[PDB]
Design a protein around this ligand. Structure first.
Ligand SMILES: CCCCCCCC/C=C/CCCCCCCC(=O)O[C@H](COC(=O)CCCCCCCCCCCCCCC)COP(=O)(O)OC[C@@H](O)CO
Ligand SMILES: CCCCCCCC/C=C/CCCCCCCC(=O)O[C@H](COC(=O)CCCCCCCCCCCCCCC)COP(=O)(O)OC[C@@H](O)CO
Ligand SMILES: CCCCCCCC/C=C/CCCCCCCC(=O)O[C@H](COC(=O)CCCCCCCCCCCCCCC)COP(=O)(O)OC[C@@H](O)CO
Ligand SMILES: CCCCCCCC/C=C/CCCCCCCC(=O)O[C@H](COC(=O)CCCCCCCCCCCCCCC)COP(=O)(O)OC[C@@H](O)CO
Ligand SMILES: CCCCCCCC/C=C/CCCCCCCC(=O)O[C@H](COC(=O)CCCCCCCCCCCCCCC)COP(=O)(O)OC[C@@H](O)CO
Ligand SMILES: CCCCCCCC/C=C/CCCCCCCC(=O)O[C@H](COC(=O)CCCCCCCCCCCCCCC)COP(=O)(O)OC[C@@H](O)CO
Ligand SMILES: CCCCCCCC/C=C\CCCCCCCC(=O)O[C@H](COC(=O)CCCCCCCCCCCCCCC)COP(=O)(O)OC[C@@H](O)CO
Ligand SMILES: CCCCCCCC/C=C\CCCCCCCC(=O)O[C@H](COC(=O)CCCCCCCCCCCCCCC)COP(=O)(O)OC[C@@H](O)CO
Ligand SMILES: CCCCCCCC/C=C\CCCCCCCC(=O)O[C@H](COC(=O)CCCCCCCCCCCCCCC)COP(=O)(O)OC[C@@H](O)CO
Ligand SMILES: CCCCCCCC/C=C\CCCCCCCC(=O)O[C@H](COC(=O)CCCCCCCCCCCCCCC)COP(=O)(O)OC[C@@H](O)CO
Ligand SMILES: CCCCCCCC/C=C\CCCCCCCC(=O)O[C@H](COC(=O)CCCCCCCCCCCCCCC)COP(=O)(O)OC[C@@H](O)CO
Ligand SMILES: CCCCCCCC/C=C\CCCCCCCC(=O)O[C@H](COC(=O)CCCCCCCCCCCCCCC)COP(=O)(O)OC[C@@H](O)CO
Lengths: 257, 144, 257, 144, 144, 144, 144
């Protein structure tokens, strides 16, 4: 049939897109450490990825914690359990909202800016002129941006959870008048260091590897035109959000199932 | 390009091997199947545990209301470690707290007297099996 | 001081950016109806905005409903209230997750593709060559894309809630073994048509006006270079996500407070 | 012609999704009006059901505390299908389980023995009635 | 450009006028203030309602434990409609269900006989005011 | 320029006006220290409230079981405003909801009679200090 | 030098945020071991507290089942500060409110009378060791 041959044609060129992505990350992270040449390159990329993402993370964390504090108050006040609001807000952020929503906003703001940057460096032949100076662009361009994304999303997640807990107490204690001694002490003996704090960090490291690898590859593999770069920037947001939400279900069934 | 296919096959296999190990470790030991029948089991579903004084040793595989007498017939899975439970051992259905799940209390009430009672090895039935309880007729008999 | 004069300088040019955005939407939507010329233009834009966004909406709705069904099962099974899982899943989607998460994915996929499209039409002088043919580009280009975004985000939200409820029942009934008569009947007398179904549609229309207006203006106001278009595409995702989450708190305090 | 077919599939999917939500997830008729005045109604609300034997026969419309005696004067919306209610009836306010919603339990005084006892039709009032409970007078009536 | 500023000022004013109307309608009627003192108020917070048989007519503004005798002094806000309440009228604290919030039961002790007692107005005190119950004395005295 | 400074000043005034409209909205204090020794406190934690009649007057910052006799020794922080409590007062531990979450009820058993009973001051010790109930020996009180 | 300052502020903010979570939101020492065998431990778990009078003095490890009798064996981690426990003590499993956790209520038999009653230190066993509750035998002891 002429339909089965076209489906197997797209199934072959999907296999060698996964193979090109495995060769790009392997040749970027392996060989000849170079701790002194890459240390100024890491600090500049840690500004573009991490510092420039703090506005969308701090402002979104306060609003999300305030919605959680308002919506969880109306549920718990039926059963006279509204002193357990701090346990509800903190646990619903350390699982499933701190890791996930900070990864979806990292993929839209820093993941789009990384695909657009690398695809612009191939449209202006900057990566080909680095190979002519006998400098490997996979070690010099790709790998400082990889480690800047793996470092900065775990650091942005812990800021998201901190200002989200503060926004939840801002509704519960300050506006609704829950006793603040009951609010904070019910939270402190419900949050465990192993089941809650460590499992929040494992999720945000798995998400940081996935979002950064997808975002760096879609710029490196883009068609170097002004319309082909914009098509690859949209492809990062779709592939990162389907992979964050898909991996979030598998890690929820493992850690808390 | 003779290398982008063999890397991509190994990479896609290493992802679904990781996904199959992860999904198996979320959803062994040899056990031995036991059967019992109750008058009322209410709340006991599948995969509900069996306990020795509070420590879980068993499971529940399927409920299967028996034809021709219309009584439920629960199938247990006791671990192979605890192979000295006799046939005078009782079963009961309990609540696991005040609002908890439901569980089976495997009461090991062994006499082991001057006559040699046997051991619950595979496929044998327990005849004690009190029932689960319902707080409708109990209020109806105490208040009349 | 030389700092107060620079702050008032940025406070003036922020006022006339809000004024340029109000003039762009007013001159696009007002005057000489043209129902026959714009009806083929609406159907093509309803493909780019609506049909091409169905993959990120259907796949994300199933995963989010499955995480809600798994995480809400472990809470409710402590108090022997796990037959109320369908009420918990449906109400937490009709408020606060159906409207919000479908608007954040609409802003990343369709909002980025609308800023990139219009800014490319100014980089190649297509909007200036339409004014030379005495065709107003605000009525011919901007306004069919506005109504396609206001129509398609309420339609994508109701698909998100439908496949999210199905994914929640897929965990509760099929995997965990809740009685399916108890599951569905507890949902049906908890969901009201006025407090839940109508309030879901009001939120997704307010979000559809805001996301589309931000996304169309940032392409129309972009600097028409290959680097200035990519800067405006990132600006859409930040401004839409801060406005969706900010408006979500104000509408939650109104509707359910 | 490829783009206009896919828009038709996109509009069909949104209509099947709106039918699934409005029918399986959320599920005007001429009624008539009654009247009652209870001592204490605590927890009752507009759009709360009236039930005979458990089956919903009508709603609650606009409680509106009566002046000059300050007793709550509940007025109802019973439906035209059940036009045979004897006016020696009763009313109670009950709680639907233990923590459920609160509803009106319309008891039917199924006698109509002599007198040609009348039928509740629009504007008529009920006399018997009963008052809700408060949980402080329950323990007051128990231990004093 | 002489028009981008006056449009942007009107647009930014029309947003914060919409935001101020919305936030006011989420967080009137002339009322008149009453004061009362209890022995124990436990659970009664600010903005808790006052009820006539189940219909909310009043509020609570501030609690304010009184110096030199150490008794709480709750400040009511009865609405101006219900201006025939005697001053034999009682107050109690009740639970609003089984696990509800807390509320003030304005038990209207209707007398109006050949006595000549006034009604009330702003700043008058109710002397009935039973108390809130504790759940700790009653198990301590009934069960000893 | 000229109007650029008037725009930078009109914004910083508005930016600090909302910072004073919110921080002053939604509401340090000198305190003094008391001590008390119970038999069982179970569920009381640090920062638990201390109440007179339902109004919070202090906190709890210690508890710390003490060696050599194995009794708990709570440290209180009453505010400086309530400096008139006699030494004939008691302390009891009340339940406040579910899941534990206890607090301390300080009943001002004020006498100020002959002999001259001293006001509690910084460092003194309340002697009555009843205890917290246990709920398991209360049903053993009921069933034996 | 502007980019390297802002990275230092970004790293400082993530350290203040990790201190806020680890201290205000979530809050190794040499210990020693005591032994006990209950009849029923229902609900108890590893890392559950031991308490004297309400104050936490240790945890729970090692809840495994004892062979040849099938009675549950619990051994504890009491802390080195409290090295004065008489071995005429008691033990009980209680429920921490009404729906809270399970904990061990170590009652101290504060006599140390004649015969120089020994001190519990590593490896010793406690023999009073009461029980847990099941809620079925409560009403079985009530109405039979
Ligand atoms: C004698 C008369 C008797 C009368 C007695 C009458 C009364 C008796 C009962 C009354 C009611 C009881 C009130 C219950 C109040 C307690 C409710 C509560 O606190 O729930 C917590 C919520 O945390 C949770 O997991 C919920 C946390 C996660 C929430 C899920 C995230 C929400 C969003 C989904 C993500 C979408 C993807 C991301 C979006 C893009 C669970 O914490 P928990 O304590 O269990 O400890 C953790 C561990 O044990 C796991 O449970
Ligand atoms: C592709 C490019 C690769 C680039 C790699 C990038 C960097 C990779 C990681 C960086 C730091 C990770 C921070 C995570 C901190 C959490 C580490 C941690 O302590 O968690 C342990 C388990 O971890 C676990 O399940 C395993 C979970 C940790 C894995 C999370 C990242 C997944 C990918 C990691 C791949 C490299 C790993 C190389 C290892 C050979 C728990 O034991 P713990 O003592 O607390 O008490 C045990 C008690 O319960 C009983 O003794
Ligand atoms: C320590 C723990 C380690 C665990 C390790 C587990 C390994 C997890 C692997 C993740 C791979 C992520 C790779 C990225 C794949 C992202 C998926 C993707 O590419 O998206 C679409 C396909 O979606 C799809 O069919 C659906 C795609 C699925 C999304 C990926 C899910 C990740 C795994 C979750 C599975 C849960 C199963 C639960 C079973 C109960 C493509 O269409 P489309 O042409 O429009 O493109 C747009 C453009 O071409 C428009 O022309
Ligand atoms: C005699 C002996 C006596 C013994 C008696 C002992 C036992 C007694 C009690 C036992 C426990 C009771 C179990 C309780 C089970 C019921 C729990 C439940 O169903 O909760 C529903 C959740 O919906 C809800 O709003 C929660 C819905 C919204 C959830 C919030 C969204 C989560 C995420 C946040 C967004 C982030 C931004 C977006 C992310 C980017 C509330 O529905 P509800 O019924 O109230 O009706 C709606 C209306 O009334 C408003 O409440
Ligand atoms: C800037 C460019 C403008 C482009 C405009 C784009 C299109 C604008 C709207 C399209 C359709 C909106 C669909 C919304 C459907 C919901 C409409 C609806 O029925 O809701 C009513 C309230 O609405 C309300 O609060 C008011 C809420 C509806 C507003 C939601 C959109 C906000 C912006 C709308 C601006 C235009 C409005 C022009 C009006 C003059 C409730 O009453 P209902 O009978 O159910 O029972 C009442 C019972 O409780 C007692 O009688
Ligand atoms: C029927 C109901 C109708 C209700 C109508 C209500 C009206 C609601 C108005 C929405 C306006 C949305 C306009 C979009 C504004 C989006 C805000 C924004 O622009 O983002 C940043 C500022 O954020 C910020 O300071 C914080 C910005 C606030 C985000 C906007 C919130 C919307 C309103 C929520 C307020 C809740 C208050 C709750 C009080 C309790 C800009 O920085 P930045 O240089 O990096 O730019 C990036 C680039 O320049 C990098 O060089
Ligand atoms: C720390 C540990 C966690 C790490 C997590 C690791 C996860 C991250 C790894 C790699 C991502 C890096 C980027 C990989 C490539 C990005 C995903 C990809 O393959 O791209 C397109 C998706 O195809 C698509 O239909 C999507 C196709 C399906 C995606 C595969 C689903 C996930 C794997 C389930 C197996 C399914 C097998 C069948 C099931 C039995 C294919 O382009 P296509 O050909 O259209 O050409 C046209 C034009 O678009 C580009 O040539
Ligand atoms: C509810 C909210 C809770 C509180 C939230 C507080 C607000 C959020 C706090 C911290 C996040 C700030 C992150 C710090 C970012 C600092 C990093 C930085 O300097 O970025 C440059 C500007 O960034 C910028 O957009 C400047 C960032 C501005 C930050 C936004 C402040 C808005 C305040 C007025 C809004 C009025 C709304 C109503 C308020 C009452 C970008 O240039 P770039 O590096 O490429 O080159 C250099 C050369 O171009 C810069 O001159
Ligand atoms: C259906 C009904 C609902 C409809 C909802 C309506 C909401 C949607 C309306 C309009 C959005 C359309 C786009 C408007 C413009 C997009 C937002 C905007 O103003 O852009 C930048 C943000 O500035 C910024 O610092 C963000 C500045 C603050 C944003 C204002 C917050 C929201 C309004 C709170 C008032 C605060 C006043 C002080 C508080 C008392 C300013 O560019 P800037 O100068 O840097 O030049 C450099 C370069 O970036 C572009 O020239
Ligand atoms: C848990 C999941 C739950 C079930 C989820 C089911 C999957 C999702 C269902 C419906 C959404 C599909 C939307 C239909 C989109 C149809 C619209 C369409 O045709 O779009 C074109 C292709 O789109 C496309 O990426 C083709 C879309 C492909 C859809 C993805 C199917 C992946 C299946 C294999 C994955 C293996 C993973 C493991 C599975 C076991 C884009 O070209 P464009 O218009 O510009 O020009 C024309 C010319 O280029 C097209 O030849
Ligand atoms: C994108 C989709 C586009 C949808 C297009 C717009 C959808 C529709 C918009 C607004 C609703 C129209 C207003 C409703 C008109 C009537 C408004 C009204 O107040 O009348 C009520 C009748 O309710 C009625 O029968 C009307 C009720 C019939 C049900 C119709 C509700 C519309 C459902 C919304 C669709 C959900 C899809 C989105 C889901 C996410 C009387 O009071 P109710 O009887 O209670 O008390 C009395 C009782 O207790 C016996 O006396
Ligand atoms: C981006 C930030 C980067 C952070 C860098 C990495 C962070 C750290 C990674 C892994 C944790 C290290 C493994 C812990 C080492 C010890 C692992 C271990 O199993 O030992 C336990 C001791 O716990 C211990 O004191 C170690 C416990 C002390 C607390 C340290 C936990 C690390 C907190 C995580 C940081 C949260 C920040 C992110 C928040 C979102 C004994 O068992 P536990 O006593 O229970 O029973 C006995 C009791 O009942 C009495 O007998």
């Amino acid at each position: 049939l002429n339909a089965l041959a076209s489906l197997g044609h797209k199934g072959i060129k999907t296999l060698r897109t996964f193979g090109r992505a495995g060769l790009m990350l392997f040749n970027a992270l392996v060989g000849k450490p170079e701790f002194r040449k890459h240390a100024p390159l890491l600090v500049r990329q840690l500004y573009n990825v991490g510092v420039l993402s703090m506005l969308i993370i701090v402002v979104s964390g306060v609003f999300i914690g305030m919605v959680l504090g308002l919506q969880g108050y109306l549920v718990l006040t039926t059963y006279s359990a509204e002193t357990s609001l701090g346990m509800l807000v903190a646990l619903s952020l350390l699982r499933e909202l701190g890791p996930v929503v900070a990864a979806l906003l990292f993929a839209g703001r820093a993941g789009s800016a990384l695909t657009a940057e690398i695809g612009l460096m191939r449209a202006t032949e900057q990566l080909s002129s680095m190979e002519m100076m006998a400098v490997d662009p996979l070690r010099r361009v790709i790998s400082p941006r990889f480690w800047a994304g793996v470092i900065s999303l775990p650091l942005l997640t812990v800021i998201f959870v901190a200002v989200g807990i503060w926004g939840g107490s801002l509704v519960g204690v300050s506006w609704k008048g829950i006793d603040s001694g009951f609010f904070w002490s019910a939270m402190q003996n419900a949050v465990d260091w192993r089941m809650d704090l460590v499992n929040c960090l494992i999720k945000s490291v798995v998400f940081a590897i996935t979002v950064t690898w997808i975002s760096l590859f879609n710029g490196y593999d883009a068609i170097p035109t002004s319309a082909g770069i914009s098509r690859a920037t949209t492809r990062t947001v779709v592939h990162s959000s389907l992979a964050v939400l898909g991996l979030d279900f598998v890690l929820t069934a493992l850690m808390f199932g | 390009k003779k290398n982008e296919i063999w890397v991509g096959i190994f990479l896609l296999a290493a992802l679904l091997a990781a996904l199959f190990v992860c999904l198996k470790a979320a959803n062994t030991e040899p056990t031995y199947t036991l059967y019992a029948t109750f008058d009322n089991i209410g709340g006991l579903k599948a995969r509900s545990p069996v306990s020795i004084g509070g420590v879980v040793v068993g499971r529940v595989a399927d409920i299967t209301l028996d034809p021709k007498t219309y009584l439920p017939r629960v199938t247990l899975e006791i671990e192979q470690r605890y192979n000295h439970i006799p046939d005078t051992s009782s079963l009961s259905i309990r609540t696991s707290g005040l609002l908890g799940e439901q569980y089976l209390a495997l009461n090991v009430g062994f006499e082991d007297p001057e006559l040699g009672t046997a051991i619950l090895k595979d496929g044998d039935t327990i005849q004690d099996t009190k029932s689960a309880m319902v707080l409708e007729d109990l209020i109806g008999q105490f208040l009349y």
